[PDB]
Symmetry: D2
Amino acid sequence: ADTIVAVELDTYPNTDIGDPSYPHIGIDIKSVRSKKTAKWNMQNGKVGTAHIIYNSVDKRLSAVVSYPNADSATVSYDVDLDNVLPEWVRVGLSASTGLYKETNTILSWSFTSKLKSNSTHETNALHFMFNQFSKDQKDLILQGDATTGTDGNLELTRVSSNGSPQGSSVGRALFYAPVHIWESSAVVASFEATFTFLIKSPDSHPADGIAFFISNIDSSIPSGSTGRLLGLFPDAN
Amino acid sequence: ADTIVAVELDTYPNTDIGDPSYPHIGIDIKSVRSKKTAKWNMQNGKVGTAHIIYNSVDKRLSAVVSYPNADSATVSYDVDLDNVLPEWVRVGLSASTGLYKETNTILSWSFTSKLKSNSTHETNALHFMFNQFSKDQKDLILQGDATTGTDGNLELTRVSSNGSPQGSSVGRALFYAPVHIWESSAVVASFEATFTFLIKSPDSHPADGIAFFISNIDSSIPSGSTGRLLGLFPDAN
Amino acid sequence: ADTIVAVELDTYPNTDIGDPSYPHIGIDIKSVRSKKTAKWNMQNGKVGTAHIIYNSVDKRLSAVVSYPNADSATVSYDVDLDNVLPEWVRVGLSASTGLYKETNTILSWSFTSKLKSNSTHETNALHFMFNQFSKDQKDLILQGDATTGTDGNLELTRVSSNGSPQGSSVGRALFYAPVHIWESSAVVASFEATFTFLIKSPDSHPADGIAFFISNIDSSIPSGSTGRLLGLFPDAN
Amino acid sequence: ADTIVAVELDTYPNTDIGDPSYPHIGIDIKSVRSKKTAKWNMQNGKVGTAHIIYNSVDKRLSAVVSYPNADSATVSYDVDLDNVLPEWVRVGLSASTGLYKETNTILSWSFTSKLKSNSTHETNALHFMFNQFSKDQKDLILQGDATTGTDGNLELTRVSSNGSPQGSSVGRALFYAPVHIWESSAVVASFEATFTFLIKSPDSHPADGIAFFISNIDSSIPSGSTGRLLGLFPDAN
Ligand SMILES: [Mn+2]
Ligand SMILES: [Mn+2]
Ligand SMILES: [Mn+2]
Ligand SMILES: [Mn+2]
Ligand SMILES: [Mn+2]
Ligand SMILES: [Mn+2]
Ligand SMILES: [Mn+2]
Ligand SMILES: [Mn+2]
């Protein structure tokens, strides 16, 4: 069914479905078993920042994750997205919790997409930046347990009144408008996404993670995609 | 029904419904009878550029229209858009033809909207830029006779195969995503729109015009809004 | 000598040279006696944000100052900067202390200037954004006691090792490159500046203030411009 | 002496100093003998567009050159610019002519540089865009025969009154302000440059080319750097 390209921030090592033995960042092309991963020194309760970049000349999806005053983790992968995704896609954020849990809070998110033609001075661009989410965010499609407005934040997975994270939860937020990633006469196509997140868990082994994904425009949360499946895939194939 | 704020480029003087005796630019707040107009020295077959700006501190909607190597026309109006439009709106371009006609071709369109909070470093922004339209532009809602892709342009009103403009036509194009123009804690809100257009008519008295508008998100072309009513209003009140 | 246009954040009421009886924001055109002022509820030790905007269609310099969780102060003034400043200018930040004092710390500064011609698709733009200053900031001209790099901040006026503010100090920081604010064929010219500042004083009556200014490119700190003269004017005329 | 990183658009094949047997695009790291080249189907008298991108995560300098309605040429090279250039550099355009010649006209140039820290929300950015050059362009350092203002264009090498290109000419234009390309705590550093050029020659074998370069901030045209040496290197080593 859905086509998914995601950058995952996987907090719980399910070494049974391929995770390394630690929290890691990975690049997933159509499967939960990452094509590439990097060790991520995850910090409970600290605000992190994820940066994701790509361009159709280099055909390399790269991601960098950092915490203030910390060394950063980075992961890269050669892949031609023209061969994996449709011409028009929707971009979004997803997260889940399972028997273990954590809060998956998004404090900001910006995205920029550009298509430059061979025509003199011809660039098509899309840019959005959210530094504050409101209770009725009409430019986002919220799926699952995702909600906006709490503390002006985006809560991807369920959190009780006190802000405690609930288990077995899954939620996604997609930017309302379709994004154009390929064009017949495009000489260069590129995108970059940035998001700041706060993962906090009362547990020692928090789970599952957060992912930035790009999918077919009509993507929806697959059945049984809670836990280790990050609200993105239907199975662990 | 609909709430409309538009900047019109009115090519045909219907002095019976308030137009001056010449082609003019005007600012319309909920009625086709402009609150303010400026004389516009319209050029048949030349590519023009319209710039529209506004900010919630000054509460002034201003518009500038120019042609290369020509003096420019400008029109301004004090108005607090918080008191006229809803919190969430859709922005778009509209055009019409009646017994007289012309081509209403859009070659490019960019829009930028920003909401800056009192929170340190908190700006929400939306920006889009089209320098090339494709036949299946999924981020635009096309209404009426508007079509995209011809010569990579946006044709707001009907044009025969040879590119001749048809009479009694009306079409609009709206950016797919809702735009947020007011926010509770916003200290400054602003927007700016730019579009380049080509108005060409085989006639001496071309009609009717083109307008940049902002409306409720569910706006649709009112009945009998061809001609002088610019695809925007239902009557000449 | 110098030509100065400044937006002042005046913390000390010198009602003898025209200040109101309280901390205020004012717009200064070539004299320290503001053309217009607004009451500013200044907060000791809180991080504030100043936004300044202008455009050559409206010919209105407006400024908004806010603190998180606070109502904001705003001040506006009709003025055609084409008639006051040269074609090429330098933009900067200035501050001073006198018998009373305070720290004048700048945590971030961004500026955007645009000149749009009547030529199709012809915009000249300059944009800079500093969210971190380094000890050897080669794109800034530092005058007086201004220094960079401390805590990655810009310190406009002298501060002892413990960060205590010194009296009788004056410093300015100017962006290295000249900025083009008018152009023969320009149909619209605009600029916007944003800066976040931290004013902290161990005193009850802190003094003097901070100002965003625009001046001739060879501007330098006038003699005896400490205190109430904000490092900008030579006298209180 | 100078440190040079350049993207060359080499119109004349000096196969004696390493050029392929045709017009090509190449990436030069400290020597005129390109580390990498691509065949470039050069078009006399047509307006081309060069796009150059780089980011410190991928450590790949890539360049794309196109003409309207033409297939584009692209060239890439893995190189860590932190190991080749200083922390602070100046960016510019250079060109030359020798016994053979051509006009080296620049119609537009934009550059964007960003440094993103590990600090939450901390980006330093520089952006400039010239779509029109004026006779007294105070934000550019012009060296050699480069001049501005003709037809609102930048003429890198000498052209007689009729616009005929002169031989043995060399000129460069550098953006006035120093650009910061590395920073201690930077997690990601990137830049992108775009320029449109018009190479026209009354000859069958036009020479020599144009190059986008990055150098030490005090770079100046080396002695005898006309012709094949592109105003960038002192010798063909
Ligand atoms: Mn896992
Ligand atoms: Mn994993
Ligand atoms: Mn009319
Ligand atoms: Mn009218
Ligand atoms: Mn004072
Ligand atoms: Mn004052
Ligand atoms: Mn050569
Ligand atoms: Mn070569």
